[PDB]
Symmetry: D3
Subunit: 165 residues, 6 copies
Amino acid sequence: MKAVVPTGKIYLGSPFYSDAQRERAAKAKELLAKNPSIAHVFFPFDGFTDPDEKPEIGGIRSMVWRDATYQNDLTGISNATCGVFLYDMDQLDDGSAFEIGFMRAMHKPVILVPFTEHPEKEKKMNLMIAQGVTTIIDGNTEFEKLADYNFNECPSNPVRGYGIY
Amino acid sequence: MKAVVPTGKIYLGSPFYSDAQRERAAKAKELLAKNPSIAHVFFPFDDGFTDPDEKNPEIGGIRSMVWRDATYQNDLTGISNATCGVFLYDMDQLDDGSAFEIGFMRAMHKPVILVPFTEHPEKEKKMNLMIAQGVTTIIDGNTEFEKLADYNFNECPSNPVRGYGIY
Amino acid sequence: MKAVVPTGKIYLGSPFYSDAQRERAAKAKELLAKNPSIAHVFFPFDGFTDPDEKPEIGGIRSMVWRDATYQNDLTGISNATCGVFLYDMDQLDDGSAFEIGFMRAMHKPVILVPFTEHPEKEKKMNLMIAQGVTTIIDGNTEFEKLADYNFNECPSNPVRGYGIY
Amino acid sequence: MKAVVPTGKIYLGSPFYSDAQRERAAKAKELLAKNPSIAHVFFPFDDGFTDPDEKNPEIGGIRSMVWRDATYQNDLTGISNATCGVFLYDMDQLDDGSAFEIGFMRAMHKPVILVPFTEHPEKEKKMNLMIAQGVTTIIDGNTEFEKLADYNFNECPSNPVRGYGIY
Amino acid sequence: MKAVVPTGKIYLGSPFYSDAQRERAAKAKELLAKNPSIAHVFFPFDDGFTDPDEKNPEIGGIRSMVWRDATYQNDLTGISNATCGVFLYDMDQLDDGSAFEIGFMRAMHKPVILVPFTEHPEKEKKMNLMIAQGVTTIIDGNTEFEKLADYNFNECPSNPVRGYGIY
Amino acid sequence: MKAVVPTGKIYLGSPFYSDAQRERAAKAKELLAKNPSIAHVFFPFDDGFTDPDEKNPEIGGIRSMVWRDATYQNDLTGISNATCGVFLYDMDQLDDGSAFEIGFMRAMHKPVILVPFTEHPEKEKKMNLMIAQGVTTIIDGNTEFEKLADYNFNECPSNPVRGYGIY
Ligand SMILES: Nc1ncnc2[nH]cnc12
Ligand SMILES: Nc1ncnc2[nH]cnc12
Ligand SMILES: Nc1ncnc2[nH]cnc12
Ligand SMILES: Nc1ncnc2[nH]cnc12
Ligand SMILES: Nc1ncnc2[nH]cnc12
Ligand SMILES: Nc1ncnc2[nH]cnc12
Ligand SMILES: *[C@H]1O[C@H](CO)[C@@H](O)[C@@H]1F
Ligand SMILES: *[C@H]1O[C@H](CO)[C@@H](O)[C@@H]1F
Ligand SMILES: *[C@H]1O[C@H](CO)[C@@H](O)[C@@H]1F
Ligand SMILES: *[C@H]1O[C@H](CO)[C@@H](O)[C@@H]1F
Ligand SMILES: *[C@H]1O[C@H](CO)[C@@H](O)[C@@H]1F
Ligand SMILES: *[C@H]1O[C@H](CO)[C@@H](O)[C@@H]1F
């Protein structure tokens, strides 16, 4: 069980469209950087440059940039042994959801790290995410556990306490 | 081309939480039924699983692990059996269940038709890169919904997503 | 939901090493032949002939026969949309177990049809089979349900009442 | 056993660059059309995608990324939809497209029928190990081409490659 | 060859119900620990999952669906993370869990080393075709057990099963 | 981001039939050995299996089924173990083994680096669509061969094929 060399290769999936999201991503990187079971961490937003493209975020992008970037995202999933998703429960990110579905189809373990700023709302979650994810670590209450989780074995921890959408 | 018998097995993916979404799903069923290239259409919300041990089932409540396991598997089984995915994609209230399913289907190399809908046609046209590039064929829900009745599901012709801003 | 044409393509996995096993296989074929949701049924024991092989069952077989037969078994799994396994709980068949594991890795649904002649023994089952299988139909008490099960949708039915090995 | 309906869905892989190559493809379609076990035959060069933004497309020159994606994806969609691959393999002018497709299909555990063709029936028989071991069934194109009309695509019986020198 | 750092990630599959089996697993761990090509060894019976809701856990009894789900997933996660499978295969009391795992690994195209053991060396040498052909490398548990300490897990050299009757 | 240990495991795919081909492979090994991001490089022609029953094996002639299986499987095991494929692609003499391997890897969603080589740098640049769209990164062998020594195999940045006519 004890690793001769770190084998955990993380695909850190996450939205990067707001300040809070960019902040959670920043913290996750630091926490994972402290985990002795990790060999490498891949963060998709850390980019391809199409020479022909004369381009703004949210604007029309060249097909070549799209292909290269999309492949870069899939390549990270292929190289990775585990997925860690900073899941925004308030503003659902279909990019992250697609990626979680993609990883599970490849039989790779997925750590869901849900974040919410509206604790008032009843804890609900889509069935596919609740049953697709292999391990859940609460981002609001247990974020720091990422620094100690054993990514060499990726022990399961089924989602519970959440009502199904 | 020129199928002896219909070979299209559709996984009709869609959210089913609001009236507008349910209406789309109902209409999609009608249109697909008129397509001669289709052999079967699987809609995940049709038949559910019943856990005899589950006391008083609350739609939206906790729910037993047995029911969860069975239902989740039914949704994957539909993908496994299907030759193609057809998603009634809500662009106003993103459905992560739907997105998980699109990613799962593409990892299995199955073609995916995206039928996006919006109640606000005037708003900015933007799509997540994973959906814009993952999907193999797009058919606008708002203006080309009817094409589902004639689209050739025996071959599933590609039609890359274009005209959408990417973030 | 209602199929325009039958789409159920069955991989009928089963041992074929005893009289009881050969009998259960015979009955399953007849039952499935009555199910209107089935397009085709594949039974691996229905064979390749290596011209060079000068051969008896259980004896040393040529590598060419092995490859051809093994591939024939995998090809049936590939063509199939669903697996139906006449699972002998008394004399475990690793061939069938391998095949169940293979099918689930391909995300295909698996119907377990367990048979036992020793009801006395506590109902036990290996975790991998209990959790790997998607639907369970008791062969001793519900064998006939194969003639009516909807293989167009393959509805789930989790294994229960079995103690884990 | 006996199929209630034809279930074989063929991915007819083949180069389409010489007259001899296109003649074989034409003949292959005819033979398969006569096979009772076939539900559908997909030939990659049949349809084709048209890119509206592609001004004066030159077949053999630079193609738009959109056309490349749509076309490549159509080629993979056929593999996904198919239950078995049938390759009109030109042993004289190796086609990497066909070889890529054979490997892709095998990674998916799908059976692959190799139908080798040579304009020099008397020359030494040699085949790359990947092709020779990757394919699940061989039907010689020079002498057994006609067998495509009777081969049981509902079950796809093996038949390992033998008689070819391995390099 | 010539790895900069060890890359072998072993999924040590094995039954763990009898004393003889447990002894084999313990010895296998020792031998693998001496192999410089190994980076990690995962043994499914090492750390288990604890369902706080599960009252009095009875090893062999019913058991909660939550514990079942978690444990089953732990066993698949080990396969996913692993680069190679190493199965201490009991030839006297066949373990279907082990067999399921070998089939799962081969469907993912991962190499599998079979280390068969028997308490009756004089009995007929017979193996199920799926195991004999599915496995990529065989190392006899009874006479070559020690090889696990020197086998190159960075490359996993093939060694087809031979000398076993097939049924 | 920065890797704590090298994580790139390369499947160095390549034909090995001409002097020029073997010279490139030799150079490729040297360049990769200098790359800090590489943990291991697998070259299919390095080891090799020996069949005891194979009397006087002729490299190029008929090989035993046992040798064929062991060797083919070693070639697939390298792909399974690898995180990325690097192909010394001979643009003059197409190699179906390499093409099969490229397709197989892509079906597995693994990145593929194409390193094309031509003895005629001035001739028309044309590539099969499957190869041109299948590969995720291109590094010209004639002018950028040296980049293999610095390319980041821990992350494998894309770089779509462009500039080649598609057929
Ligand atoms: N890597 C990436 N994934 C998704 N959207 C993006 N936008 C910019 N870079 C991106
Ligand atoms: N089939 C289904 N899939 C996902 N969530 C559901 N909720 C109720 N039925 C469902
Ligand atoms: N198809 C088959 N599968 C397994 N063992 C066999 N023995 C003979 N035919 C067989
Ligand atoms: N389907 C196809 N595959 C490969 N090259 C092509 N050129 C035109 N159509 C093609
Ligand atoms: N890890 C495990 N896998 C399978 N069965 C088990 N029973 C107890 N622990 C187990
Ligand atoms: N590894 C290998 N792959 C293909 N052909 C070969 N001939 C000898 N070794 C070989
Ligand atoms: C793809 O999906 C998300 C963004 O929506 C990222 O995790 C990854 F790049
Ligand atoms: C899983 O995703 C959606 C619900 O969110 C359905 O299509 C399918 F059941
Ligand atoms: C492979 O496994 C069993 C025999 O042990 C059959 O189901 C199939 F042929
Ligand atoms: C892809 O490869 C060949 C042509 O090179 C076709 O079979 C298919 F379109
Ligand atoms: C699953 O199979 C066996 C137990 O039967 C273990 O190796 C693994 F946990
Ligand atoms: C299989 O294909 C080529 C040789 O044809 C090698 O890369 C690998 F061994």
